[PDB]
Amino acid sequence: MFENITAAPADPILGLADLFRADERPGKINLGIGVYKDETGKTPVLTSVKKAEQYLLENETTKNYLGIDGIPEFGRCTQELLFGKGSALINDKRARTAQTPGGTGALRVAADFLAKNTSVKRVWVSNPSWPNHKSVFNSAGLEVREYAYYDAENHTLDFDALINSLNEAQAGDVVLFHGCCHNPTGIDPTLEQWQTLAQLSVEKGWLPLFDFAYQGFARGLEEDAEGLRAFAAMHKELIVASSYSKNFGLYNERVGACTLVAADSETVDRAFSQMKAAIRANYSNPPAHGASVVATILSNDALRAIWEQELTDMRQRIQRMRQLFVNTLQEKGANRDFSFIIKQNGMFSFSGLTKEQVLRLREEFGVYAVASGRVNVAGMTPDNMAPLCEAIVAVL
Amino acid sequence: MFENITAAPADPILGLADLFRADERPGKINLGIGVYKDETGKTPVLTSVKKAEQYLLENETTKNYLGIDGIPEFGRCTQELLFGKGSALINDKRARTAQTPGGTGALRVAADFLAKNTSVKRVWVSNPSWPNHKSVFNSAGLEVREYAYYDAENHTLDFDALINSLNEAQAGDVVLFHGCCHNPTGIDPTLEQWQTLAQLSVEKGWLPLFDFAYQGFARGLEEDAEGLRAFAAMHKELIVASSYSKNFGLYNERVGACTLVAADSETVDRAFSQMKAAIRANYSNPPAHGASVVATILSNDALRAIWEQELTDMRQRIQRMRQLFVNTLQEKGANRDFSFIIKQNGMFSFSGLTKEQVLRLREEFGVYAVASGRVNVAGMTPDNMAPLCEAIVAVL
Ligand SMILES: *Cc1c(COP(=O)(O)O)cnc(C)c1O
Ligand SMILES: *Cc1c(COP(=O)(O)O)cnc(C)c1O
C-alpha cells in the first residue's frame, strides 16, 4: 500500500539546517534560522518562565485533561493582550479563545472550522508570506490566492498594488493579515493604512484572519496590536491566531490561541461549539505545560514585569543589529544602500540579495541565509557582524 | 458569515461531567469518567514523573523547536515498548515513529496521511468502539464502517460475527484494532484469535491500524503487546497509534506516538516524509514536556523501575474492584449474575444496564455512568463500593 511511490519535498527554510551542521570551517554563520538568539548565540529559557516552571512543579497535583479549549486564565490573558483591557469585545462576551498547539495549530483550527462550517472557499495571503500558510489552508480543502505586498524595487509596502489586487476577492473570502510585521519582509502597514484597509474589508465583505506571532517585537505589546484593534473596532466577526513561541521563547511547548469574534455572545458560542468540534477531531485538547507557564506569568505582577523586561531586551537587541548591520555595511565598502533595514520590524528582513549571491555566500563563505534572500538579524551578533558584512560586500 | 445558524452536538461522555458538579446530595458517585483514580478519588501526578520533571527544570537550557517527528530517544523507547528489544522490525529499520499530541493526535495523523497519500477510502472500526474514532476518520474525508464484536447476550467477543462481517471489506481498507482491550467493553482477543485474525488480514489485504492506549493495564506491558507483535510478524506494512496518557498518567501533556511500518527502510522513509508533511500542515511539531518526561524515565533504570511499580499498582487496583464489585453485587441482593466483569481488562466495562436503569441511577440515586451502560471501575473505591452496588440492585 505504501511500497513504491509516495513522495517528498523539502521545506524551504527547514532543510537548510542540515548543512549548517556539516561545515568544519571556522567562520560558519547561520542567518536563515527562525528563532531568536541572544548576543552569545543561544536561545536561553526566559528567567521568567523558569520561575513559573518551579511554581508549577511545587503546585500541580494532577495532570488531568484540560477542556477542549484549554485553561480559562490563558484565554482571557490572551484576549486582554490582543484587544486591550477595556474593549467592547470582552465586556460584551463577543470573543471565544481556544488554547491551541502553537500558532500553526491555531491556523489549522481556523482552517478546519472555516472549511467545514462556513461557505469559505478561498483565502488571500500576501506575496511574500510565511510558506507554511499555503499547506495549512490547502490541507483544509481551501485553495490559496495572493495579494501584492512588496513585489520589490523601493524596498517598501506597495500599497496601491495590494488594493488593486485585493479587489479581485469576493465577499466570503478570508484575507489573512500579519498583525505584527510581516514574515518575511518585516514591512508594516502604518496605522493610517490599517485604518484604510479595515474600512475596505468592512465594505467588500472580506472576513479578516490575523496571524499574530511576533507581538512585542516591533514597537511594544500595545502598539503592535493597534492594527488588529483598528479592525476589531470596525468588524462584527474576525479570527486571530496568536502565538507565544517567539515572545515567551516557549517554542517547543507549542503555545498558541485561536480567537473567534462573532457580533454577539449567543452567536460566538454556537460558532465556538463547532470550533471545539473541529479540535476534538484533531488532537482532542491542548498541551498544558506551556500554556500553564504563560497564564502563571501574565497573572502575576512580579513575574509579568520580569517577562516584559525580557521582551524589551530581545526587541532592543534586534533593533541594535538592524542599526549596526547597515552601519558595518557602510564602513566595509558596500555597493548598495541598505538603509531600508531599519524600520522593518522584527527578526526577518529581505537582504535584497539574488538567489545566486545567497548560494555564493553559502558554498564558500560560510554565511547561511534563505535563498529568497531572507535574513534573521537575531542570528547577527557584535563579533560575528564584521565577518558577515565583509562576506556580503564581496558579492555586492 | 457565522451570524445565525451553524450548530452543536454534545459529546456522549464529555457532556455528562457538567451535571456531576451540580448535585448537592451526599452520595454522588461518578463512574463515566475516562481517567484513572486511586482508592481516595484523585488522579495524582506519578512519583516517577515528578522526579523527571525536577531533572528537566535543572537540566534544560533551551525551549527550541523539536523536529517534526519529535525527540529521537522517545521514538525508540516507544518502538522497544511496542515491539520488543530484539525485533526484526527495529534492527531492520522498518519503523518510523512521529511524536504526536496524545493518541487522538496520532490517529488524525494516521488519517491525514492515509487520506492524502494512499488509495484508502474506508476504515472498519468495532461495534462498539471509542466514539471519537468516527470523527477523527471522517474529518480526514474517510467514511467509517463497523465490524461486529459484541452485539450483547453472552457478554463476550462474538468471534464468528466479527469475521463474517469483516469479509465485506476489500483490500485497501484499513481495519482498526484496539491492542490493549477494548474501549468500551474491556473484551480481548485471546492470543489464539489475534493469530487467527493476523493471517486473515494477510490474506485479504487489509492494512491494520492498532490503537494502543492502555498498554500495561490488562496483564502487563509485554503480554499486552502480543496481539500487535503477532501481526507485526505477519505484516509488511502496519500503523500504530500509541498513547502515554493513561499509563504515565500524563493526560493533559498530550503524549503519543504514530508508528508507521513499511517492508523496508527505504520505503518507510519515503512514506514517513509525507507523514511529516501532514504534521507540518497541522501543528508543525510536537509538545516537548510530556514526551521529554516519558523519554527521561524510560531511559533511566532507577526511574523506570519506580514507574513500573506505579503501573502495577494501578493495574492491580482496577483488578481489585472488578473482583470486589462482582462480590458486593452478590452479597447485596443482585438479580443478575455479573461474573463477566472479571477478565474483561482495564478501566471500562459494560455494566449490562439498560439506557433507563442508567437514567434511573442518575436522576435520583446519584450514580453517574454513560447511557450505554459503560462504567469506569477505576471510579470505584472500597468505601464507595456498597452505596453503589446497593443503588444498582435497586434497579436490577
Ligand atoms: C512562527 C509563526 C507562526 C507560528 O509559530 P509557532 O511556532 O507554531 O507558534 C505563525 N505565523 C507566522 C507568520 C510565524 O512566523
Ligand atoms: C484514550 C484513548 C485514546 C487517546 O488518548 P489521549 O488522551 O489523546 O492520549 C485513543 N484511543 C482509545 C481507544 C482511547 O481510549
Curated annotation (Swiss-Prot), chains A, B:
**Recorded consequence of changing R374 to F/Y:** Second-order rate constants are reduced by >5 orders of magnitude
Name the InterPro entries on file: Aminotransferase_I/II_large, Asp_trans, NHTrfase_class1_PyrdxlP-BS, PyrdxlP-dep_Trfase, PyrdxlP-dep_Trfase_major, PyrdxlP-dep_Trfase_small
* Record-level GO cellular component terms: cytoplasm; cytosol
Keywords, alphabetical:
Aminotransferase, Cytoplasm, Pyridoxal phosphate, Transferase
Applied biotechnology: Has been used to construct a 2,4,6-trinitrotoluene (TNT) biosensor strain.
The family database entries (Gene3D superfamilies) matched by this protein are listed as: Aspartate Aminotransferase, domain 1, Type I PLP-dependent aspartate aminotransferase-like (Major domain)
Phosphoprotein listed as a keyword: no
Which amino acid positions bind L-aspartate, per UniProt?
G34, W130, N183, R374
**Superkingdom of the source species:** Bacteria
Major localisation: cytoplasm
- Biological process GO annotation list? L-phenylalanine biosynthetic process; L-phenylalanine biosynthetic process from chorismate via phenylpyruvate
Effect after changing R280V? Reduces first-order rate constant over 25000-fold
Which top class of enzyme applies to this chain?
A: transferase
Q: What Pfam families does the record tag this protein with?
A: Aminotran_1_2
The protein's GO terms of the molecular function aspect are: identical protein binding; L-aspartate:2-oxoglutarate aminotransferase activity; L-tyrosine-2-oxoglutarate transaminase activity; protein homodimerization activity; pyridoxal phosphate binding
Residue list for modification N6-(pyridoxal phosphate)lysine: K246
Q: What is the reaction catalyzed?
A: L-aspartate + 2-oxoglutarate = oxaloacetate + L-glutamate
Q: What's its EC?
A: 2.6.1.1
Triggers of expression = Transcription is increased specifically in response to 2,4,6-trinitrotoluene (TNT) and its indicator compounds 1,3-DNB, 2,4-DNT, and 2,6-DNT.
Compartments reported by the entry? Cytoplasm
What cofactors does the UniProt entry give for this protein?
pyridoxal 5'-phosphate
Similarity annotation: Belongs to the class-I pyridoxal-phosphate-dependent aminotransferase family.
What NCBIfam families is this protein classified in?
PRK09257.1
**Which PANTHER family did the record assign?**
ASPARTATE AMINOTRANSFERASE, ASPARTATE AMINOTRANSFERASE, MITOCHONDRIAL
Quaternary structure and partners? Homodimer.
Q: Provide the protein name.
A: Aspartate aminotransferase
Which lineage? Bacteria, Pseudomonadati, Pseudomonadota, Gammaproteobacteria, Enterobacterales
The gene name on file is aspC
